[PDB]
Design a protein around this ligand. Structure first.
Ligand code: HEM
Ligand code: HEM
Ligand SMILES: Cc1cc(N)nc2cc(-c3ccc(OC(C)C)c(CN)c3)ccc12
Ligand SMILES: Cc1cc(N)nc2cc(-c3ccc(OC(C)C)c(CN)c3)ccc12
Ligand SMILES: Cc1cc(N)nc2cc(-c3ccc(OC(C)C)c(CN)c3)ccc12
Ligand SMILES: Cc1cc(N)nc2cc(-c3ccc(OC(C)C)c(CN)c3)ccc12
Ligand SMILES: [Zn+2]
Lengths: 412, 409
């Protein structure tokens, strides 16, 4: 039916969703199963591409209040002849900007979407080589960082053609720390990044073999083999982590980078596929995964912090893990704030998202939202999103997962 | 098809076949997921449902197709023909009630599902008898603090005009009163029901922890009030193992969580009064929402007594005071030898429970939105555990509150 209702059980506020009617592709759920906690549940032909392009162009001309206009009809005819003759088409600059903002606006799992309209779009579709990709990525990092006053941005490289000429950033984020598995089984650096670290070493990277080695960019242009580049260290803003009360916390030697910039996702606009589209914002404190690091040869940060807090770690019901996790997250927010590097705590981010979601229900007719990903990884129920019912559905333009490029790349 | 679920910490992959047996809907569609939405019989329809349940009962005792299986199917069929309903055998009631718990996708405590004490109250005819059955349930389940899981099942729905109902949401809850300004004396969750009890003749002590009276409805009659004997109500004063000032907050809670407003469905039959009880997970105990003074709740007051910076949210003072309150609850129950489980232990048990269920049953319906605890989610092992949610019967269902349906006599 046309209307779907969601309720906030703290405030009793009821919102009516009609935007779900524009949902495009399946969720994986059926009337008899829900896959809401499942992590994720050769190119387009001509006849596949015609309706996807028309739907995006219609949506674009509706958004600028020119629906059915002469320019709308002429744009549609242009796109159709272009697909008819070249099996693909090119977006105008305005449509590219529109589509990237709306892929962020449509990202159900993103709590930071109140900012969606302020995204800075860098058009890199004239790029032809990995050196040019490096240039574009350096400028993006410099612009987005802005000496700590972080600005959201995306850089969009050429779209996919036949599938054998893809542009790809092999990094999962533009800035991440290396991880090195030792022979004795322990891990030095970030354990999340051991596989990609091994790939870089294999491609020729000389690793410093420290705890916080910024990984090199591994960049692939036009389907060619990827090439390694070192980001200039002055472009990488970092924050040492200290605690406002625990003078010993700085002795852990922890730091983190300021700029979260995800680079392994695919951007889909009007049936066109931008397989290289790194996008960046600023952190929510809880995301910063400094928790997983190893302080010594056995204990991770959560254990090491609790040990220095003199907590009882023999019983789980002493809640020493919860107590230590709070102090770690206090330290993260204090350090970014003291250094004037943009960051948002989870109470502020979730209060903003509720305001955002309400505005979207009124002005747009709904807001696709993935509760499983929107609720913060700690203190869930004391944030306003916990008691908020949400509807999840897939609108396009969208950001999508894609397989890792080392699994598919045909080495030259 | 079979569906896989992955734990993203252990990389353990479980294969789910049980979802292929579910026949009730979840609310989702191919195009919209509603996993965060809270709430998404005639003679002709009854026998298929009953046969379905009878089939799975005799499949469970490894006597499918047996003589007794067929005779029982024949019996249930004739009985629906002549009477438009049927009665469960005691064996089937026990099996049904345990599997309603086994199938409750939102319950993290289901490792215990087969240790459920079932009290058959299907001979009850009056609210006085309901009171008797309920007192015996509370005394048995409390067991001087060594809590034991139990359910008491009252007669099933007949024509819908004669339901048995427990009007309380839990057997034991604290009253909550509307204050002249706008704050709340007692539990804010129970203001409406407290007012209902006062309208019905209850004399409110107007305290902070007034145990509510039982409001009991038999055979569709007007409900009647009863005072649970206070010696049957086990309570725990909340104190902190480090903060000597915590006991000065004067808080306490009751030991026994006994939910009484849900509906049990077995083989097409509906049991609208079926209070069931277990023991608490520490994070459930809603003492956080009380008021200490005339403006500040326990969370604000705790942070105040802790001398935290309450001006910015990024000081995370709420998160700090939340953990301490939860340490105090666990310390207090453990010190009085009242059964309680922490969210770390309970979610650990649930992952082991899922392993068991996939091995022996082919799956386990699980609602991630409700299984993950309301604090420290990602440092518990269920956060990174993919789950499949689906609806099996027997089941516990939500039902309307009786005061919205009842025509007073
Ligand atoms: C501006 C500040 C931003 C904040 C504070 C923020 C916050 C978040 C958080 C907390 C998550 C979940 C993280 C996790 O579960 O590990 C997330 C996911 C996501 N964000 Fe945002 N975000 C921001 C900006 C952006 C921008 C600029 C884009 C794209 C243009 C974006 C697109 C996404 C997407 C696609 C996901 C989901 C990824 C997936 O499904 O795997 N975000 N965001
Ligand atoms: C024995 C110890 C038990 C523990 C520790 C436990 C724990 C929990 C928790 C923490 C919740 C969610 C609470 C919330 O969201 O506030 C829950 C839900 C639930 N529990 Fe259990 N439980 C236990 C026993 C039982 C028993 C004995 C039954 C019934 C026979 C049961 C039936 C249910 C049901 C039906 C729900 C979901 C109700 C709904 O759909 O809203 N539980 N349980
Ligand atoms: C722009 C931005 C800002 C921010 N503050 N946070 C962000 C987090 C993600 C994100 C989070 C989780 C995730 O999936 C997990 C398996 C790590 C993915 C998939 N690459 C992306 C993506 C973009 C983010
Ligand atoms: C149910 C659920 C909810 C949520 N809100 N988030 C989740 C994040 C992960 C997840 C998956 C993979 C992964 O890492 C690599 C294997 C891709 C990480 C990061 N450790 C997290 C898995 C499940 C999640
Ligand atoms: C036997 C048992 C033990 C326990 N330790 N905990 C339990 C919690 C619920 C429960 C929790 C929430 C809930 O619904 C919320 C919307 C308030 C309902 C049904 N209303 C039941 C039900 C039974 C429980
Ligand atoms: C999305 C979600 C997840 C979860 N895990 N839990 C949730 C609990 C409530 C909820 C709703 C009503 C309510 O109160 C009565 C009106 C039933 C209470 C208890 N105060 C909780 C609402 C939403 C929840
Ligand atoms: Zn779903």
């Amino acid at each position: 039916p046309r209307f779907l209702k969601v309720k906030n059980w703290e405030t009793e506020v009821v919102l009516t969703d009609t935007l779900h009617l524009k949902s495009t592709l399946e969720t994986g759920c059926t009337e008899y199963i829900c896959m809401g906690s499942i992590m994720h549940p050769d190119v387009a032909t001509k006849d596949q591409l015609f309706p996807l392009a028309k739907e995006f162009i219609d949506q674009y001309y509706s958004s600028i209040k020119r629906f059915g206009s002469k320019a709308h009809m002429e744009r549609l005819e242009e796109v159709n002849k272009e697909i008819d003759t070249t099996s693909t088409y090119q977006l105008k600059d305005t449509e590219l900007i529109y589509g990237a903002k709306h892929a962020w606006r449509n990202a159900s799992r993103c709590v930071g979407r109140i900012q969606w309209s302020k995204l800075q779009v860098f058009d890199a579709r004239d790029c032809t080589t990995a050196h040019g990709m490096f240039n574009y990525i350096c400028n993006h990092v410099k612009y987005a960082t802005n000496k700590g006053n972080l600005r959201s941005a995306i850089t969009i490289f050429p779209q996919r053609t036949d599938g054998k000429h893809d542009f790809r950033v092999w990094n999962s984020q533009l800035i991440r720390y290396a991880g090195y598995k030792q022979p004795d089984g322990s891990t030095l650096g970030d354990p999340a990044n051991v596989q990609f670290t091994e790939i870089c070493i294999q491609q020729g990277w000389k690793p410093p073999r420290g705890r916080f080695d910024v990984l090199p960019l591994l960049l692939q242009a036009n389907g060619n083999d990827p090439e390694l580049f070192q980001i200039p260290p002055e472009l990488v803003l970092e924050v040492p982590i200290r605690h406002p009360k625990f003078e010993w916390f700085k002795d852990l030697g922890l730091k983190w980078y300021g700029l979260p910039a995800v680079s392994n996702m695919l951007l889909e606009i009007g049936g066109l596929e931008f397989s290289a589209c790194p996008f960046s914002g600023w952190y929510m404190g809880t995301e910063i995964g400094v928790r997983d690091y190893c302080d010594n040869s056995r204990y991770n940060i959560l254990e090491e912090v609790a040990k220095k807090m003199n907590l009882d770690m023999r019983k789980t019901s002493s809640l020493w893990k919860d107590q230590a996790l709070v102090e770690i997250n206090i330290a993260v927010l204090y350090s970014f704030q003291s250094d004037k590097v943009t960051i948002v705590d989870h109470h502020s981010a979730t209060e903003s998202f509720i305001k955002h979601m309400e505005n979207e229900y009124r002005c747009r007719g709904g807001c696709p939202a993935d509760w499983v990903w929107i609720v913060p990884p700690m203190s869930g129920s004391i944030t306003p999103v916990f008691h908020q019912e949400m509807l999840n559905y897939r609108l396009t333009p969208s950001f999508e997962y894609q397989p890792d490029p080392w699994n598919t790349h045909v080495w030259k």
